[PDB]
Amino acid sequence: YDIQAWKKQCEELLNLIFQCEDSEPFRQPVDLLEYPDYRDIIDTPMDFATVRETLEAGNYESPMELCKDVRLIFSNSKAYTPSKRSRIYSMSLRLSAFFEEHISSVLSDYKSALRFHKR
Ligand SMILES: O=C(C1CC1)N1CCN(c2ccc(F)cc2)CC1
Numbered sequence: 039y040d041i042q043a044w045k046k047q048c049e050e051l052l053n054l055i056f057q058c059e060d061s062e063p064f065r066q067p068v069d070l071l072e073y074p075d076y077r078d079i080i081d082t083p084m085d086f087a088t089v090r091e092t093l094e095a096g097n098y099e100s101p102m103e104l105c106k107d108v109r110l111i112f113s114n115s116k117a118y119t120p121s122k123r124s125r126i127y128s129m130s131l132r133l134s135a136f137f138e139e140h141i142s143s144v145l146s147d148y149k150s151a152l153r154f155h156k157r
Contacts, residue, residue: 039150039151039154041152041155043147044101044144044148045093045098047101047144047147048098048104051144052093055086055133055137056086058136060133060136061086061133062129063115063129064086064111064133066087067083079117083114084114086108086111089104089107089108092107101141102145102148105141105145108137108141112130112131
């Protein structure tokens with residue numbers, strides 16, 4: 039029932055994601071010199087350094103907000119991919135499965151703790 043525990047749990051999950059080779063294309067913002075048309079297709083760029091910085095600045099109120107931004111990294115990759123078989127998109131699918139597998143208990147514990155708080 040710790041309402042604040044999600045934050046360190048998310049920091050540890052981001053550290054694991056940064057250690058994972060599949061996160062390398064997603065660790066920093068989109069390079070517009072490499073992908074000049076990126077902003078023609080993607081309205082809201084997102085990356086893991088921006089997620090980590092938002093968390094460390096105290097700018098996420100809940101793990102659901104962090105989860106929305108991490109999911110945006112993966113949906114941007116899916117929207118920008120020229121093929122469902124591309125290398126970078128394939129890395130995003132594995133990383134998404136790893137993220138979802140680990141974030142589930144973080145969301146569940148936070149939501150349970152908040153329901154207990156408001157009981
Ligand atoms: O510029 C970058 C990274 C160097 C920072 N990105 C924009 C293009 N993204 C992308 C996604 C799926 C795809 F299949 C191809 C590209 C990957 C991340």
